[PDB]
Design a binder for this molecule. Structure first.
Ligand SMILES: COc1ccc(-c2c(C)nc3c(NCCNC(C)=O)cc(Cl)nn23)cc1S(=O)(=O)N[C@H]1CC[C@H](N)CC1
Ligand SMILES: Nc1nc2c(ncn2[C@@H]2O[C@H](COP(=O)(O)OP(=O)(O)OP(O)(O)=S)[C@@H](O)[C@H]2O)c(=O)[nH]1
Lengths: 465, 167
């Protein structure tokens, strides 16, 4: 009864549930938990959907059979949920197949919507320059619009909705590569529930530049047929037709937990998880951060040093706008430094770091992490006011605080990674001791004085280049 | 922002340093508490005698080594809990402290916090103010909980500071 005591206590959450489900070899416990999933809030369980579905595929039938009933239940009350399941089910098996087909067995409008987006991207491969690609895209997006507002939605959206219109002229391609990703803007009419609501009616139709997000909404809105409606909102997604997003999703989950951990404790680190959508092992979409551009290009259009740009765009050292931006810089630096360290993120350069209009940095390309095989340049240190600076000392103070916080909730983090490693061929799990090395990096045995030194050492390392 | 005044908060653990900072700068308080690990930073701008200043407040800890942030501080709020005599008792050692690691010409305010705990008072206002003028410190009692004198405390020390006008 001592076990059952815990499961019936307040201490029992979806996190704990999955852990026992993952670890317990007792079929009685597995089945017990399978049933208890229903009592939890839909939102809480959703976050762990990749784990649940992974277990289903790669674990003993007993474990699977306990999870399935809950999944089917959700699938039956939400096609969004249905969609995300089917996509995940497929991507993570290359046991799964039986259930995927049953779920897909309705979604045809959406799957064709998604198919076309993927199809588009693959065609642009024959156009060897960036802007050549852009023009074919813009043209071809216009063909999408010919399809009326459809019984399709962007799973990457925070809410339920119908897609009505694609402002094709605003879309842009992000690089010149063979299977280049591309950014698009999408118009939607919000729902209260997708599953019960009539597709909106067509409203007959009749320039793109560098601008803030709210200025872009104005311009797109004003031009749009549906723009007058209060129901109307603008979304955005990056489409990756030939890039795997399964590592990207994993990192996202890790970032989200760490975000919650640092939120739960009172450490004012700052980071920004961006939503991920796995479509295949081949392909996915990303919800982009608005009002942000790469550091590298920030330096190419400005011709300035990082510090100088801050001063230009926000103000002199005596201004509020600057000090706010500096603070946001320092806090976002400490956050992402810690994330880079814990996940062992590599391939770190100014192409992979974004700067938002408030001064936060944001890392983005999470290939090369963990077993798969961060820089504190003086340009970054300058913005912080220099090594002797109080704000720089504070940067070090935040890192320690955020490290101490992470240790207090280490298990929530390792859980996320350790389950995913299951039966996994991701390059990040290439090692024999991927999860084991991860735990060592938390230094759970260390005293805080020891951690101060380690933090000092970390910073010293980050400067060598 | 005309000026920039750096101020530190120091004192025994539990006296309310961290809540003083959150009340004064974000107008927030909490009964549940997390011990301050190292240092915490918050900022707010005010006007004294017609002049716009900006204060950078540092919430230190009761992790003994927070010393470094002291340097280049014009003012320091040294806080004790009125309802816990020991915290007032160590104020003598806390003044010997400032006379080791900080500017010998720094503005100090003695602060009795948690004045709302009327019935638990373990340090009489007279005894405190006596020590206050026995020394070279300014003195006030605050409650972070009800926000009594919290604004006053900052505005006092900042005004006192500005009285260092150079000719
Ligand atoms: C790993 O891959 C990722 C990961 C994250 C993102 C992403 C997100 C979430 N947010 C933005 C963003 N924000 C500005 C949006 N502007 C407005 C106003 O909405 C601009 C850009 Cl460039 N990326 N980005 C994109 C990609 S990727 O698939 O495109 N590969 C990139 C292509 C550009 C190369 N420099 C790096 C590698
Ligand atoms: N009744 C009353 N209780 C207070 C007051 N201020 C703080 N408390 C309590 O005292 C405790 C002080 O915690 P804290 O906010 O960290 O200040 P501090 O102790 O000076 O800072 P620290 O070095 O220990 S982290 C809090 O639990 C808080 O609930 C107050 O003004 N009135």
């Amino acid at each position: 009864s001592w076990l059952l005591r815990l499961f019936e206590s307040k201490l029992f959450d979806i996190s704990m549930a999955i852990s026992y489900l993952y670890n317990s070899k007792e079929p009685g416990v597995q089945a017990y938990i399978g049933n208890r999933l229903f009592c939890f809030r839909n939102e809480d369980v959703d976050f762990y959907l990749p784990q649940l579905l992974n277990m289903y595929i790669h674990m003993d039938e007993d474990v699977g059979d306990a999870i399935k009933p809950y999944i089917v239940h959700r699938c039956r009350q939400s096609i969004n949920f249905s969609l995300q399941c089917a996509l995940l089910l497929g991507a993570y098996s290359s046991r799964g197949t039986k259930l995927r087909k049953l779920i897909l067995s309705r979604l045809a409008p959406e799957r064709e919507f998604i198919k076309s987006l993927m199809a588009i991207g693959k065609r642009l491969a024959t156009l060897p320059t960036k802007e050549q690609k852009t023009q074919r895209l813009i043209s071809e997006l216009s063909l999408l619009n010919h399809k009326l507002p459809a019984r399709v939605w962007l799973p990457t959206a925070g809410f339920d909705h119908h897609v009505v219109r694609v402002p094709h002229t605003q879309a842009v391609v992000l690089n010149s590569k063979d299977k280049a990703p591309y950014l698009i803007y999408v118009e939607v009419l919000e729902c209260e529930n997708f599953d019960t609501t009539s597709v909106p009616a067509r409203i007959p139709e009749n320039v793109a530049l560098k601008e803030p997000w709210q200025e872009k909404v104005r311009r797109i809105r004003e031009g749009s047929p549906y723009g007058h409606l209060p129901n109307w909102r603008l979304l955005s997604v990056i489409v990756k037709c030939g890039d795997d997003l399964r590592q990207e999703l994993l990192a996202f989950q890790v970032l989200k937990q760490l975000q919650s951990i640092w939120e739960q404790e009172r450490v004012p680190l700052w980071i920004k998880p961006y939503k991920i959508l796995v479509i295949s092992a081949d392909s996915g979409m990303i919800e982009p951060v608005v009002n942000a551009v790469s550091i590298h290009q920030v330096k190419k259009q400005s011709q300035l040093s990082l510090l100088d740009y801050f001063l230009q765009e926000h103000g002199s050292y005596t201004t509020e706008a600057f000090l706010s931006a500096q603070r946001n810089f320092v806090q976002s630096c400490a956050g992402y430094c810690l994330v880079c360290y814990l996940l062992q993120v590599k391939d770190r350069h100014n192409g992979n770091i974004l700067l938002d209009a408030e001064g936060h940095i944001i890392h983005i390309d999470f290939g090369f992490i963990l077993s798969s095989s961060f820089k504190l340049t003086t340009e970054f240190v300058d913005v912080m006011g220099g090594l002797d600076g109080d704000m720089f000392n504070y940067y070090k103070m935040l890192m320690l605080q955020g490290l101490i916080a992470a240790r207090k909730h280490m298990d929530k983090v390792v859980q996320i990674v350790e389950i995913m490693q299951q039966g996994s061929q991701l390059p990040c799990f290439h090692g024999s001791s991927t999860i084991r090395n991860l735990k060592e990096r938390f230094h759970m045995s260390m005293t805080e004085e020891q951690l101060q030194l380690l933090v000092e050492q970390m910073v010293d390392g980050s400067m060598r280049s | 922002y005309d000026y920039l005044f750096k101020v530190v908060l120091i004192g025994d653990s539990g006296v309310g340093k961290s809540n003083l900072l959150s009340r004064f700068t974000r107008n927030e308080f909490n009964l549940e508490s997390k011990s301050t690990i190292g240092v915490e930073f918050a900022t707010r701008s005010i006007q004294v005698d017609g002049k716009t200043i900006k204060a950078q407040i540092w919430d230190t800890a009761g992790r003994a080594i927070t010393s470094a942030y002291y340097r280049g501080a014009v003012g320091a709020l040294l806080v004790y809990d009125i309802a816990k005599h020991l915290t007032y008792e160590n104020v003598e050692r806390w003044l010997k402290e400032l006379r080791d690691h900080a500017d010998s010409n720094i503005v100090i305010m003695l602060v009795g916090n948690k004045s709302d705990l009327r019935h638990l008072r373990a340090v009489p206002t007279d005894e405190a103010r006596a020590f206050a003028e026995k020394n070279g410190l300014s003195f006030i009692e605050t409650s972070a909980l009800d926000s009594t004198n919290v604004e006053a405390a900052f505005q006092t020390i900042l005004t006192e500071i500005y009285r260092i006008v150079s000719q």
